[PDB]
Symmetry: C3
Subunit: 388 residues, 3 copies
Amino acid sequence: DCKRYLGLTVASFLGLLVFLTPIAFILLPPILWRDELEPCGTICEGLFISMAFKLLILLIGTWALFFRKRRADMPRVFVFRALLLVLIFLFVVSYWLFYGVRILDSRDRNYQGIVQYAVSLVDALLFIHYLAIVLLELRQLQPMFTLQVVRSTDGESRFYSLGHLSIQRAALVVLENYYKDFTIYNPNLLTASKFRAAKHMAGLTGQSRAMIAAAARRRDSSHNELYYEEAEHERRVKKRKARLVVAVEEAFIHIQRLQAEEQQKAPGEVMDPREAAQAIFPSMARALQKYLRITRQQNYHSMESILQHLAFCITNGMTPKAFLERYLSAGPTLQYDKDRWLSTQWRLVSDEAVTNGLRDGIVFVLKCLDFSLVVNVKKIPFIILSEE
Amino acid sequence: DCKRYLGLTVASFLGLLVFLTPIAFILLPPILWRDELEPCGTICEGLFISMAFKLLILLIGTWALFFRKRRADMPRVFVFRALLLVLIFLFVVSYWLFYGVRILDSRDRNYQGIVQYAVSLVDALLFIHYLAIVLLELRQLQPMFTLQVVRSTDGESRFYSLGHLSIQRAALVVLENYYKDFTIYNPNLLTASKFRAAKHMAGLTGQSRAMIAAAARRRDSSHNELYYEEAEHERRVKKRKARLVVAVEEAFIHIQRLQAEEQQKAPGEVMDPREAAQAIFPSMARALQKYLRITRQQNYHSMESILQHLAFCITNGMTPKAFLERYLSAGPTLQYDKDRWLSTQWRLVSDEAVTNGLRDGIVFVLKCLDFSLVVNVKKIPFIILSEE
Amino acid sequence: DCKRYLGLTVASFLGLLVFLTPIAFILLPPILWRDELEPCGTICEGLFISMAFKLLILLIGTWALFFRKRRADMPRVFVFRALLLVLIFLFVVSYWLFYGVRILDSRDRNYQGIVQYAVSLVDALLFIHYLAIVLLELRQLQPMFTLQVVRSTDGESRFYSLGHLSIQRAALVVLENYYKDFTIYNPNLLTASKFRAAKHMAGLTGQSRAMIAAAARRRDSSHNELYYEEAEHERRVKKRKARLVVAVEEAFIHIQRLQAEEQQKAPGEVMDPREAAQAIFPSMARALQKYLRITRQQNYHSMESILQHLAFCITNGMTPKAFLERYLSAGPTLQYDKDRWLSTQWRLVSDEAVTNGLRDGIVFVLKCLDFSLVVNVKKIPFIILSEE
Ligand SMILES: CC(C)CCC[C@@H](C)[C@H]1CC[C@H]2[C@@H]3CC=C4C[C@@H](OC(=O)CCC(=O)O)CC[C@]4(C)[C@H]3CC[C@]12C
Ligand SMILES: CC(C)CCC[C@@H](C)[C@H]1CC[C@H]2[C@@H]3CC=C4C[C@@H](OC(=O)CCC(=O)O)CC[C@]4(C)[C@H]3CC[C@]12C
Ligand SMILES: CC(C)CCC[C@@H](C)[C@H]1CC[C@H]2[C@@H]3CC=C4C[C@@H](OC(=O)CCC(=O)O)CC[C@]4(C)[C@H]3CC[C@]12C
Ligand SMILES: CC(C)CCC[C@@H](C)[C@H]1CC[C@H]2[C@@H]3CC=C4C[C@@H](OC(=O)CCC(=O)O)CC[C@]4(C)[C@H]3CC[C@]12C
Ligand SMILES: CC(C)CCC[C@@H](C)[C@H]1CC[C@H]2[C@@H]3CC=C4C[C@@H](OC(=O)CCC(=O)O)CC[C@]4(C)[C@H]3CC[C@]12C
Ligand SMILES: CC(C)CCC[C@@H](C)[C@H]1CC[C@H]2[C@@H]3CC=C4C[C@@H](OC(=O)CCC(=O)O)CC[C@]4(C)[C@H]3CC[C@]12C
């Protein structure tokens, strides 16, 4: 709690002082001298309301665009943010020094000559705001480069289009798209592949090349063990899927019967779905467990999670197919619980510095626990179009 | 017609008057007094052209961004639009009152002091324009939240990334992505599922739990009726697909033969594809009807629509595979006719008010005739990246 | 090289002169007259720093948004770019003429009256910059229209959402999405289809319609030759895929064994993957060639490309599944070599003028060597949402 307040005060007090700087500039001359005032006329009154409106617009824009919580942590310093911060710092301190030196040191600088200066601040500071969207959001709008992300474990391949962005920013975009695009990582397939491959190790340069070529030729004429076992596994998966579908349909029929029975007990008082899920889960529990075992998905789907999903479906009145399809096949990472995914162990590996922008032919790696994503960057070819 | 003009006049006259307000401000002093003019010099001439250029830029921007037809109707009031409208209203009326009170009430306010005021308007109003993109478009650029949309009927699941948006805006985005992303809703599958489930109803707490567990265990050892009938249906669908492919290939061969025959009749005079479609449709009509019956897609595909698609393919000279794949499997909603989809019966259900912004863990429902879409909102986890 | 420099000088000198125009405007009066200077005071000093900051912001924005290489060539003139260029040209020349006529022709226009003019330029020019994003990027942000792109050869269908854009811009967006979205074009399937269809040609109005209907009815009762041969082809493809998977697993086991053996030879000195790939390729070469022959993918995948991919996987330590899936099925165009795709022969065909904006119901064609993409444009329906 203390750290949050300490971080918030730094960003709040500086913003408050830079926003009230025009107010101080327009309220200091009246309080410094009283009998030396020159006739202001009307230009000051006309400029005051325009300055107030510009300040209100700046406040609204700052709240809309930049009053938000940080989403990700950058391994290195952010070039654009640091540039904007130092630009704002100099923009403020130079004006403060000018006001303190060229104005407060002499009995001069009439009020009518200060208000036009004051509106010169909000006119310029807003321009800095106009720069902020340029470096952050408007720079990446154009689809310049193409990023291909391939997983090292299961080989899932995805394609995205990005603009002129840093390596770290591109990696963060790839990571945020990974959760909602890539299939959940399953180490069971990796363990099965390792078990299959370990048999060759357990069993055990022109001449060596000839010998290995002859061995490969002999293997090509051997029995195709993989195909028949894959077909049998697919048949078993289909049979268990059909059994699970039938069980879920019967469970939903029982749910409808229970709701109908509870309707007569009390009108206008819907029952809580929790007890219905409690009573209905054992009916399909065996089928669901068998399907998870045959699909190697028991680790991700927990009993409490299944009950919560069933209760959510009961509240929404979803069809049995919607409930079935969640456990049917593996999907996005965000579907499962929060503890399933880790957003802290991610690392970036690249020969080039991450501060540099995207270039054609550069390749980087996003490492994480037991798995890595290789990202290839390519340049969009020069498309030439002609009217026939 | 009258309603359209009435709505257009309100948005046109106000824009015209707010755009011509600087013109009135710079043209009223010359017409009010003539012999009281002060020497303007050159600053007024320099400011006039800058004001004209700023007005031209504002006109171009207003035409580009905001001169467009409304796309969707908001069930509640739009906060950002109302805020912008009231801000513009006060920005105009306060300046009008200031001009009418502090200037027109006395023989003062020399011309050189008014032009600098006039350019203060277009400088500020454009800033309001700069605010309009901030609240409407620039606010949703950052991918803050993730929305998962699941259909209640068939369980189709999709994932999207949105920014800081209202519940109604997120629902509208989900709806507009539904047409081009989700598969067309097919009630035939629902009717088949209901017919299958009705058999159990027609046939008909620890002890009850034990009895239902024993019944489920006995059912698990029963015959798997679903798998074999699904396999037979898939085989029939594949056979009818092959027959339809052969029929379409023969029809395209006949189309090519007819075109070749018509070539000799008259050079440079291509035949209208309508009669070719008329003559060719009966050849593949039986196969197409059988495929639609076996795929439960006869309702969506009409005979006139099939003829129009065939004529379009003849004009474009598409391969038979392109024609086949449209009727092969169900696709997006926008493929079929306009009357197929309804954009009026949509409703929004959410415990929280739709005016509030997106928050983690909130869930809402988009209802429509016989089907609902459940949308879950999640927050992107804090991704921490480190350089190894 | 000469052409690049000639093109760069035109865009560089004009930018330099328009950026230094305020500097010339503020530095010419001091060098023209010396003894006629009026007391400047302090407003000039306050405006100078604001002008410098605005110039710096303009330079940063110009570098960020517009200092980039051209991506595509427009067959016709670009309306927005031409409008911006002519607007800038007039904005510069009119001010230059005004400065040369109304200032340099008389011993007038005191310095204090010029600086406020000078800041009037950077205030307006930046606004022109604010217009540039409006016409180019901010105009297409709103998802107005939907574009459906269907290939003429294989019938691949994709859907995209675009804004208020010209026909040329929409075609360019479709083309840039085609590489990363559509499957690579394979003429082998077209040749097979043509060979299958040529048999009917080689073998060879109410009465004609009856005869063709009877022929179609007789054909519907004939043998389904396509289904059985497709099933046999699928079985052969699956068997060869399993054999290739086994061969790749054995090759990766050999790679791991070679790496382990080389580890003892020298610590901290990793071997180059080129020789390992050279020694390992013959082991899986026969299986890979057989799979390419059965999948008609031998043309795209070359031996050098396979060796490079194997070396890349060895460097990244990818699983055999990742290596297998690249050659498993045809994917995006960008995966293969640069020479595979052509971005010069693209042509645009449309009855309406390409300079006009997108409208509902308009259809255009993107032609290229042996294949065309038909794009249909539709308007998003008016969605009406109500709170229950
Ligand atoms: C008058 C005002 C606008 C001056 C503002 C200061 C900038 C000129 C400074 C502030 C932050 C600096 C950046 C901070 C960090 C880096 C990372 C740094 O990366 C490396 O040293 C490794 C990559 C390499 O080898 O080049 C390269 C310079 C750069 C972009 C700096 C470039 C110069 C910047 C933009
Ligand atoms: C007479 C006065 C007005 C001249 C002012 C010079 C500026 C136009 C220069 C000086 C320092 C430059 C900056 C120095 C370092 C950086 C970091 C640099 O970062 C990178 O290379 C990584 C980001 C990317 O990929 O663009 C990008 C250019 C930038 C912002 C430069 C932009 C142009 C700046 C502001
Ligand atoms: C000096 C100028 C800029 C003043 C402009 C007026 C605004 C302060 C007003 C105009 C429209 C108002 C909004 C109109 C409608 C609503 C919906 C309203 O929703 C509810 O009452 C239900 C949700 C809840 O329980 O909070 C909440 C306030 C809000 C956002 C209002 C907040 C205050 C707003 C932005
Ligand atoms: C001394 C003067 C300059 C103070 C001016 C105060 C403003 C900075 C305040 C006063 C009224 C506020 C508004 C009152 C109500 C609304 C509606 C409110 O709407 C919502 O909560 C839903 C939209 C969303 O999710 O952000 C968002 C904040 C906003 C625009 C507020 C933004 C900040 C405003 C303009
Ligand atoms: C005071 C300043 C802002 C004037 C700037 C000049 C514009 C009014 C000009 C410059 C470029 C012109 C465009 C250049 C090319 C074309 C394509 C041209 O296309 C055709 O002639 C075929 C389509 C048809 O049949 O209308 C239509 C006019 C247009 C958009 C022109 C419209 C008028 C433009 C925008
Ligand atoms: C008293 C003074 C300030 C009046 C100035 C009139 C402008 C508001 C007009 C005059 C010329 C017009 C332009 C003439 C031609 C074109 C090209 C035209 O191009 C198209 O139709 C294709 C692009 C699209 O789909 O919008 C779009 C409108 C535009 C920019 C027009 C925008 C509005 C302009 C600048």
